[PDB]
Every structure is written in C-alpha cells, then in structure tokens.
Design a protein around this ligand. Structure first.
Ligand code: HEM
Length: 214
C-alpha cells in the first residue's frame, strides 16, 4: 500500500476482526454487558490514555510525531477522569483496579514513548482513530444495556467535543500521517507496532472476561 494510513488499515484488518471476535467484545456487541464489565473497560481506558497522552506530550515537538499532534481534538484523559468519578465515586482514584493486563499495555506505551518515539504514531492511530470511527456504535450499545439513570454523566469518553466532524478530522489525521517521512524499516515497524497494539487490547479483553466470570 502507498499511504501509511492505507497500509495500516489493511495490515490490521485481521487483528481487528480478531478484536471483534473476543468473547468480552462479542458479548458487548450482543448487547450483553454489565455495570461491572463496563466499569473495568473504563478503568482500563483511563490507564491506557494516561500513559499514551503522557508520552505524546513528551514527543509533541519531535518530527516523528508533531505532524499528528492534535491535543485539543483528541485528549481523552480529562473525559475519563469525569467518567470514573461517576462510575466509581469521589474516591475512584483509590479504588479503580489496575490489572496486570492493563500494566502490560501501559508498559509498552511508555517504552515506545521513551525509546522508540517513531512508533508512537502507531498507538495514537489505533486508539484515537479507532475510538473515533467506532465510538458511536460502541456507545449506542453500552447506553442501552446499561440503563443507567439520567445524571448527565458517565459517558463523556464517547464524545470528542472539540471535533465538529469525525469524518473530516479522520481524513485530516490520515493526511498528516501520510506526510510523515520514514525509512521503509521504520514504516514496517510502525505497521508492526499497530498489530501489537491490537494484541494488547485483545489480551486485555481476555483478562477482563476472566475477572468477571467467577
Ligand atoms: C470489538 C469490536 C469493535 C467494534 C464493533 C469496532 C467498530 C469499529 C467501526 C464501526 C469502525 C469503522 C470502520 C473504519 O473506521 O474503517 C472501526 C475502525 C477501527 N477500529 Fe474498531 N471496533 C472494535 C474494536 C476495536 C479495538 C479493540 C480497537 C483497538 C484499540 C479498534 C481499532 C480500530 C481502528 C484503528 C479503526 C480505524 C482503521 C482505519 O480505518 O484506518 N477497534 N472499528
């Protein structure tokens, strides 16, 4: 494939379907999701985005990332902080779980962000773009199966307020990725890192499913 974005999308088709097939994600799609299962996914997201956005801020000016740096449009941490306060309460920071599978994901993120900056774009792509184009469908489901009250909170994560049009921003971000110059070596590694990203989510889904079936 010519474009890195077109290359990524095609190289991760397999793992993505694999992601959709995961037991946890299947039940989620089959409208089957519990408050406890949803809390774990939000807790996970908070840990993942904290680490990811921590590393993006460290490589904000680097030529290997600057092109896809859109902090106001994409930051999710603040939104998740708001959400976890609703799901876990005022003391959420003390009680939210931080599991081994979440730590594995968080660890690879810090590693790439500290010793392989040129691969960070692979994680920002997988997370941000994935949650943006598939966000609505994923939220639509959850909010029905959750039948939560109407306190006006708990799902801020699924809404990117600083993005007027998801499609127009998607194409813009892709454009910026395709503008990134890299050796075929690096490019191949970025492609790999994206596949790796999907595997870190899949094993995470496996673990969460395990924790909820005792
Ligand atoms: C379990 C089922 C999931 C559903 C139902 C779902 C749904 C969606 C939808 C509706 C799209 C739109 C098609 C497109 O953008 O090309 C999409 C794209 C994508 N998803 Fe998923 N997704 C799931 C899980 C995940 C996971 C675990 C990740 C990884 C964090 C992920 C990463 C992506 C990426 C990166 C794209 C955009 C690729 C591109 O077009 O360049 N998705 N997803």
């Amino acid at each position: 494939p010519q474009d890195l974005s077109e290359a990524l999308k095609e190289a991760t088709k397999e793992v993505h379907t694999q992601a959709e097939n995961a037991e946890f994600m299947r039940n989620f799609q089959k409208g089957q999701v519990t408050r406890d299962g949803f809390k774990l996914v939000m807790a996970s997201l908070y840990h993942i985005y904290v680490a990811l956005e921590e590393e993006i801020e460290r490589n904000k000016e680097s030529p290997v990332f600057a092109p896809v740096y859109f902090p106001e449009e994409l930051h999710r941490k603040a939104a998740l902080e708001q959400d976890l306060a609703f799901w876990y309460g005022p003391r959420w920071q003390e009680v939210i779980p931080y599991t081994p599978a979440m730590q594995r994901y968080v660890k690879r993120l810090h590693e790439v962000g500290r010793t392989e900056p040129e691969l960070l774009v692979a994680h920002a792509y997988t997370r941000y773009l994935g949650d943006l184009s598939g966000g609505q469908v994923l939220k639509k489901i959850a909010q029905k199966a959750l039948d939560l009250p109407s306190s006006g909170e708990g799902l801020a994560f699924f809404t990117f307020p600083n993005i007027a049009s998801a499609t127009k921003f998607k194409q813009l971000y892709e454009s910026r990725m395709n503008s990134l110059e890299m050796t075929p070596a690096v490019r191949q590694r970025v492609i790999e890192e994206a596949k790796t990203a999907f595997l870190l989510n899949i094993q995470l889904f496996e673990e969460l499913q395990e924790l909820l079936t005792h």
